[PDB]
Ligand binder design. Sequence first.
Ligand code: XV6
Lengths: 99, 99
Amino acid sequence: PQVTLWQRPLVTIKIGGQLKEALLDTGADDTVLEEMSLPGRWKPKMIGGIGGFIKVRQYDQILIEICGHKAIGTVLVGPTPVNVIGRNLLTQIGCTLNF
Amino acid sequence: PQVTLWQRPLVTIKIGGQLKEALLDTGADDTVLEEMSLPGRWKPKMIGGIGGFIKVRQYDQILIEICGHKAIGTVLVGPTPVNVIGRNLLTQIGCTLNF
Ligand SMILES: O=C(Nc1nccs1)c1cccc(CN2C(=O)N(Cc3cccc(C(=O)Nc4nccs4)c3)[C@H](Cc3ccccc3)[C@H](O)[C@@H](O)[C@H]2Cc2ccccc2)c1
């Protein structure tokens, strides 16, 4: 649906059978979520942001439902203070930016 | 225009009579710019990111032209690695997310 930016653009996600809210984040290449137990194997990796870098675990091929749409892809879990949905999944749910 | 998110959503800005590219960033509450020269009064301020916190300088009521649209707002300059325009300017430019 359409969202204005007077408030942070927060949605519900279900991931790993857990419900969370998350930020839709156009500045973010990748999705990164607070620490969480997902099933499966994961590769260690690192991402940079404002402030510097953090090490995260990368899980691939996980199902997430963001609003009502499902999408599969790579999700980083790690020490972020907010759950962010980056452009990798944003593209799958058909999200555009408009002005 | 409408932007899809297969690429970083980069826009040209003119600020302080300098030309820069910046990312349109829905997850950023504030706009923050790499170190560059602005005239006038600033204040210290600290922001949070993934990775950590950075010490930044708050300048108020700077005019920015963002994709040619004008806005006047607080911009933070400082050690970001990428120039970010955040929700405080995005709302003035009339920017919306659609899915
Ligand atoms: O893919 C990624 N990294 C990779 N590296 C290598 C390969 S992939 C990646 C994925 C998600 C996020 C980011 C890193 N990231 C952030 O650090 N911030 C902090 C931010 C940015 C701008 C402003 C604020 C802000 O207003 N903070 C405030 N503090 C106090 C008041 S306001 C905060 C927020 C998200 C956020 C909001 C609140 C709290 C914490 C974070 C942005 O919205 C994100 O797009 C992005 C911006 C960015 C992108 C690249 C380099 C530097 C910065 C990177």
